[PDB]
Design a protein around this ligand. Structure first.
Ligand code: BEF
Ligand code: BEF
Ligand code: MG
Ligand code: MG
Ligand code: MG
Ligand code: MG
Lengths: 137, 137
């Protein structure tokens, strides 16, 4: 089953985000870029959420690669420093579907999640149709 | 072009929500259920957002019908009274994709919007494929 990947510098927000999502998804949790890529390798992930402000590699960077190695996956950013334009510009260059502000309702953040996974589902069958309708003409 | 429908009891939040979205969508605004249905008649709408707490008819009710008369349209609820279970249950029976808490970032609420419209787009071509791949077998 498609899980959701949680990826934040502070391990107390993975803790939280899980508490909000665990009841509905298979939550996978990671402490940063290099740590997280490791997981998308072995396990299968429908949705990912990433702190932007992370030591070393930023969410936007991580996700530029995620976009490249596993394009079937819905990418989401999350920020408490929502006031910066540089960021948004960065966000707006990458293929980032949702950007959430901190903090967040257990039921809101939960929703941006159910979204992503419904979306991941559309996109994924939206492609099936194609592939299979190619194998006709 | 597909617009977005805004539908809230307090005309000062339509004011706001527009200010957040106008730069990116064709915003249509309505003061409540009966008022809003009137608009989906003449004009074409890809995304709708509805206050739950509205005199007379509630968002969830409105949207149950919207779901029925214009199913191609992405439905969204928005609440400041996020603590009620009755609601969520109601929300969870209807076909409601996103539920936002008040208040909201200009760039968050903005995003739940861009979401919806990308989604409205998937769903709508996801169907094209079908219809057209039916006209083969
Ligand atoms: F700093 Be992260 F964006 F919360
Ligand atoms: F009362 Be609405 F939900 F803001
Ligand atoms: Mg629990
Ligand atoms: Mg941080
Ligand atoms: Mg403006
Ligand atoms: Mg109200």
């Amino acid at each position: 089953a498609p899980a959701i990947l949680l990826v934040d510098d502070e391990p107390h927000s993975l803790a939280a985000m899980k508490l909000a999502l665990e009841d509905d998804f298979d939550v996978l949790t990671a402490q940063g870029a290099e740590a997280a890529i490791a997981i998308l390798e072995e396990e299968w992930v429908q949705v990912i959420i990433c702190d932007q402000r992370m030591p070393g590699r930023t969410g936007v960077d991580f996700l530029t690669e995620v976009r490249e190695r596993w394009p079937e996956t819905v990418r989401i950013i999350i920020t408490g420093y929502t006031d910066s334009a540089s960021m948004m510009a960065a966000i707006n260059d990458a293929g980032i579907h949702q950007f959430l502000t901190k903090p967040w309702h257990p039921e809101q953040l939960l929703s941006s999640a159910r979204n992503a996974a419904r979306m991941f589902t559309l996109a994924r069958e939206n492609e099936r149709l194609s592939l299979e309708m190619r194998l006709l003409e």
